[PDB]
Design a protein around this ligand. Structure first.
Ligand SMILES: *Cc1c(COP(=O)(O)O)cnc(C)c1O
Ligand SMILES: *Cc1c(COP(=O)(O)O)cnc(C)c1O
Ligand SMILES: *Cc1c(COP(=O)(O)O)cnc(C)c1O
Ligand SMILES: *Cc1c(COP(=O)(O)O)cnc(C)c1O
Ligand SMILES: *Cc1c(COP(=O)(O)O)cnc(C)c1O
Ligand SMILES: *Cc1c(COP(=O)(O)O)cnc(C)c1O
Ligand SMILES: CC(C)CCC(=O)O
Ligand SMILES: CC(C)CCC(=O)O
Ligand SMILES: CC(C)CCC(=O)O
Ligand SMILES: CC(C)CCC(=O)O
Ligand SMILES: CC(C)CCC(=O)O
Ligand SMILES: CC(C)CCC(=O)O
Lengths: 304, 304, 304, 304, 304, 304
């Protein structure tokens, strides 16, 4: 929780950010969202890969043809505003575009417009406080992720999350911290809400987008950092068994950051601790906020 | 629109039926809903297959493990209440169970409870005023319906509708009234929001639930009425070409009722008008509210 | 070979029935055809299920949207004409509608019309003289039949036959008489150019159309005859192994008529001879031309 | 149209290039063909990648086991002959090998031989005169391309085109210039008769042959030219959504040459005009016939 | 354990029934087996559906082309002998045909013969003592059963069980008594080593063999018993969610007999105890050994 | 055959290495094995990639959760011992870990242990004496290899071989030396018991592990050797037709070593003899045992 929320152009007090119960998105999952993080750094509060997330918000809405009034720059300025306004140095930002109080027909009437919301608030490690250091225990779920030409997995839309709910809850019900989903073909897709990486003989592996895996921005950052460290990266389809044969395995995401996976299905991964390559990558990633890692791509956007 | 909405046990003015913008269902599609119809009949206002719809509401919530405080009888009494309170003789009722203002984690915290809403209001023919008589022009969509073990198609959940949105909007964008989706295997599934039936040589055909088709209550009623009329019904997988070789084809649903399909992909179906078997079924269905058709199953629930 | 061929409305001498080498169908497989048989019977020459084949010719062209000038009755009269004209008592008739000398673009220009041809000539048993009595040796091919929503298997079109060529030639190259194809899922579809039936514990089994099997008219006749004989018929998906466990197995088609399969992949079927149920069915089928079997459906069309 | 056509070794007047209506290829799609282009250049008339096309003609025939009497050099000499004989400086050449007047059995009798035809004539831009400059509007088809082990997509055979007909006609029926087909898995295959390329962040992307995409010779030329220009090329499986997120997208083929795609499914691609990378490639391609681009591979075959 | 084992025609003492460690079956899973039960009844010791099991033994070996020296009658006689010789009144019999000490090449040399073994011994309820009365808790496995045309699921061969090991161990590792596997399409196949049945609205449902389910002999008996009791049986494909919506669910097998399933994935089935229809079937089944159920089919084979 | 076999830590005479007929592995395919080769070289008897094979033995058992008492070093020491003890200078070693005489339940009781066996003996070329020089004739099988998430293809387990038996026996039954299997998608997987390679335009191609191909150690060696020779290697999915268009094709495996394939399905590959690239690779491979090829990786383990 925080003080204000940007709602359609104006800062509104948290308690007043309400919407009608007949809002389209509540009944039909018609919304698109993003997960962005603001980190306190050596240059003060900074939003990580800000433009890239806002660009993806526009891309997700474009696929579903949701009209967006605000431009990427407007959304970026609004985001910074929310952080200053709430006096946050570090936080989790949540942009949400949704179809509001329009008719009850599945297809909204021509000429309608969407409601936009940007909320910021402090949020710790998604998979746990000690998760980044010690790693987590994952389980391969019995539920598969969406098939290729059904519900576009490249779009970060609300309705998609019924799948993540099923995958993740099943893992947690059995004592695990997160669940790993396979696609309809039986290959590794990704975790319930985070991308999956494997390390084998010093080489980094990740499933392509065609494995029903969302084009993670953290995923993209890791691939670029790895190339700077001189680590070979291979984007290819991975079998289920590969999880038991890999030297290391970890998950990535905005909320999950970079979490090591110490075991899968009760089978220990390597030494059962955070691996050496995962460590190098974590150090290089968090080094961006200390100044140890040079921001060569302009991933740090100053809030001021 | 109407005057009141049942919200968590009490009648609230329509305009005051608001919910926080950080409600789980707005971000993750975590909601379950129903479509029920109240018809003005020879016995006064009557809710069609009321218990069955409320039973399915509980079933959809059960699959996702959403806790429901209200029993089927409570929900039924609340439904009748909304209709009387709003002075409606005929209307479309919309029960909605959703995960409210709880955390932002995909998996709701233990001990949470859902919010329930029941709204009633007048609503005409989903596919058009003259649709029931003249029929509509459908198009086979380029988007497929959800694969079998991904997002359960037997549950009527909010997030599911991103698919119906894609299928339906594509058809309407090209001049058609509705779109027909095929499953991932290339077989007929159903319309964007209505079951599909075909008539060939006096025999009724419908895809099974395993074709990613939701277990329609109108679909079930039609199969039962058809058997009363002495019409053979075959529940089997159907190829795409069957739509072009069928003597008749129609759609079923609570909102769509029984709508004839006069053409598919520009190819005329039979005579290009409502067929004889579809006619028989329409008369038998609507006859329930006139008294011509005996309600042998107890499908009519008096509102009083 | 015979004397005349019906070509676009007029009887032309066989040798003169030529068409330009730039005819669309030669380059793009754009043609639809039928296989019909005329049998010498107790009522004289009679065409078997004449209207049904002509109706299917129209259906196949309809799916591909090929314009057909002739009506079903015109085509039927033309067919009878060809048989009388050539003095045939028994023969194989071959109706062929194809896209002729039009442009070279894949999609023919609007307003074009198709060329129609009807040729009749004597033709023995497709799988061999002794095949109907002793049976044949079949082999399951390594090539699969067309997937569901790619090239419609319900249409009897020319281009489809590249598949039948592959399936059938492979079997014959290895010493077998015919090849049996599986669909993309690994279930039994049908032979290269004939439907497949299995007999197990007195029950008849056949794959549905959804197994990429063409809706055979001989197949349909057998199903109806079987029901008259009090034989249970089950139209369901069949596994590959079922061919080794079945008591009997046979193929059906216009050209192949009813051919028993004595072995599959070197594994003998039952006694390695024509089975009892297959025999009953053959007797009932050929009995239609002797008068022993009453033509209750009007399958025999007199040529006069 | 032109004056002569090479038919089985000798130049025949166009109007006399006839074949019997009972030719195997008319009924069973048993033919293999090529699309070659002759360009007027700085070195006079020149056939683009002549040997490669004739080599593929032999390869397609080899897969189906069609006997070819003519060697690659004979076919090349005959091709040049047709161009000179018809006084063409620029034209579209169409080599066609087909199973002629042999029996009516699906499998041709042993010892048979095929008929060969080579026709040349002027032909403009396949997708339109202004298509190369302005680009076209494409639509993702509801029909999928052939599954992997059914009808070999690597062979350019006649029967294959029933699929291209379905995909292309559907697009044109809805106001689009061309249709893009997905494979049975739901991934991008290619256009109805042209390969598909996408540009994203300066990188070129194309589906592999395993996506049911024919090994285009223009496709191969573009990949080689791109590498000369220092553009990274990635041959990988592509999701349907990628078409909406791509900076640029274009089609390639002998008849279509290099056509930009300005929109897909009503969604604008980048700027809605020919993109910068597509431009570079177009200039480099057409530069071959001006002398600006050095023919390092020996792609230009002088007709003389 | 017992005193003797029938080994290649002769009664050998249990302790001496050894085979070389280089036996083909030990390295390549090349064996076929059966599970048969001998019950103490009102007619004394009786082997349940003896011939049917031995017939299936021959069928499984036939699929793999393993040569069997003994006829069905000899194997039945041998089975009865082992039961008498070991003084058993009730027991579990295990016939096993395997490729013995032959070469190390995958394909055994021509002219080889198999080794046959028949061991009998007392064996309680597979899923537990109180499992038949109380029911068990099942879990849907993350591992799928063999695809249709890979390793024939209709054959009861040794190598198949690597799959059952994976499915069953996963369930037991999480606190469940048995695991339920889905096929590659995402539909219900069966338990790790027992067929699956569902009861909904008084109707019995079971997946067909094409769902990668072995043709259970107990399954076949239940279907026939149910028809005697006037219970409708439907053999059709079932979705995963159906397990949560079913009134009752139970498993069948020789070793498992008829075990009720009180919960699936933590979701209670009906009342959480053995259901009414399951009970009727159990009573009818076990009634065969008391005389209450008339053996109309000749399922009880006297040992003497 | 040889004199001794290492059995659970002790050298036992060949004839005495027996196990009970009720051993779990005999009935359920519950075993894991390796194929290793000892070559007579310039440094004396040497085991090729010894550690890698023993490492994979542990990996296969780990996937199935079979407990292994011996460490990789103990197994390597045991392997060398057997070779010395049997006075072998060149041989084929066969390590086999299997579930022994434990209960008859599919899941072995907790606390059980496995039996380990290591047998060594002389063994010639798997596909024939002159196969390495002349090449073999292969056939594409009608049986497909295991689907992705069913029975893990990355594990070299006993039960897997029912598939290899079917694929290989079918080829041999038709006059071929080996069969090539496609996966469930219709793409090339590998031979019945050896990996598959293709050479096209001087480039090496091999299917990835996700094509249901086991991670061959010989396959891995060839890829590394090829990179040393400056030959481009591409690990990608391959279509069936690619076998007919390839310049060269060969198989790899411990027992098969490097065997050229001169024809596939009766279609000659290239020149019909061992190709140039295959030859270079063979010479480089066998050169390791002569000293001509430097062992840069430490692949040769001295027996002493
Ligand atoms: C958002 C998301 C991720 C993480 O992506 P980032 O862009 O790295 O935040 C991973 N998986 C799924 C399913 C997601 O929706
Ligand atoms: C609700 C629904 C239907 C219609 O079902 P009824 O129970 O008859 O209202 C059809 N298809 C989908 C996708 C639906 O959600
Ligand atoms: C025509 C055909 C048949 C036979 O059908 P009939 O209508 O019985 O002549 C069977 N299979 C295929 C592939 C066919 O095209
Ligand atoms: C011929 C063809 C192409 C274009 O290939 P080019 O060799 O470049 O002429 C593309 N797609 C299909 C289906 C084709 O047949
Ligand atoms: C043997 C078996 C069964 C049970 O079959 P019964 O003939 O009833 O003993 C069920 N499932 C599998 C996988 C089996 O092997
Ligand atoms: C063992 C095996 C191979 C060969 O692997 P190598 O490690 O090279 O011996 C190939 N295919 C299969 C199916 C195998 O089991
Ligand atoms: C809520 C998360 C599962 C998804 C967005 C993120 O990674 O922040
Ligand atoms: C909007 C509709 C598709 C909802 C279901 C119904 O009420 O029929
Ligand atoms: C030629 C045949 C394979 C097909 C048509 C028929 O059955 O007559
Ligand atoms: C008509 C075209 C699709 C043929 C291929 C080409 O010439 O490009
Ligand atoms: C272990 C069991 C699954 C074997 C088969 C049976 O007896 O039911
Ligand atoms: C029989 C062989 C396929 C076993 C593995 C090998 O040694 O290559």
């Amino acid at each position: 929780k925080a003080d204000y929320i940007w709602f359609n152009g104006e800062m509104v007090r948290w308690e007043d950010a309400k919407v009608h119960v007949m809002s389209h998105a509540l009944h039909y999952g018609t919304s698109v969202f993003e997960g962005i993080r603001c980190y306190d750094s050596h240059k003060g509060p900074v939003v990580f890969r800000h433009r890239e997330h806002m660009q993806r918000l526009h891309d997700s809405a474009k696929i579903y043809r949701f009209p967006v009034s605000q431009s990427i720059d407007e959304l970026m300025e609004a985001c910074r505003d929310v952080i200053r306004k709430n006096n946050l140095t570090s936080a989790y930002i949540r942009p949400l575009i949704f179809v509001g109080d329009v008719g009850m027909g599945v297809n909204p009437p021509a000429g309608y417009s969407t409601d936009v919301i940007i909320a910021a608030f402090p949020w710790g490690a998604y998979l746990g406080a000690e998760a980044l250091e010690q790693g987590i225990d994952a389980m391969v779920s019995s539920w598969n992720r969406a098939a290729p030409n059904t519900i576009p997995t490249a779009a970060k839309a609300g309705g998609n999350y019924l799948s993540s709910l099923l995958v993740g809850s099943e893992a947690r019900r059995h004592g695990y911290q997160e669940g790993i989903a396979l696609d309809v073909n039986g290959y590794i897709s990704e975790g319930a809400g985070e991308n999956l990486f494997e390390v084998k003989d010093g080489v980094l592996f990740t499933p392509p987008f065609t494995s029903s895996a969302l084009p993670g921005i953290t995923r993209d950052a890791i691939i670029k950092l790895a190339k700077e460290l001189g680590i070979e990266v291979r984007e290819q389809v991975l079998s289920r068994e590969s999880l038991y044969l890999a030297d290391e395995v970890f998950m990535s995401g905005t909320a999950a950051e970079i979490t090591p996976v110490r075991s899968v299905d009760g089978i220990q991964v390597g030494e059962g601790r955070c691996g050496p390559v995962t460590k190098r990558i974590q150090q290089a990633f968090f080094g961006l906020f200390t100044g140890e890692t040079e921001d060569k791509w302009g991933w740090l956007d100053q809030v001021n």
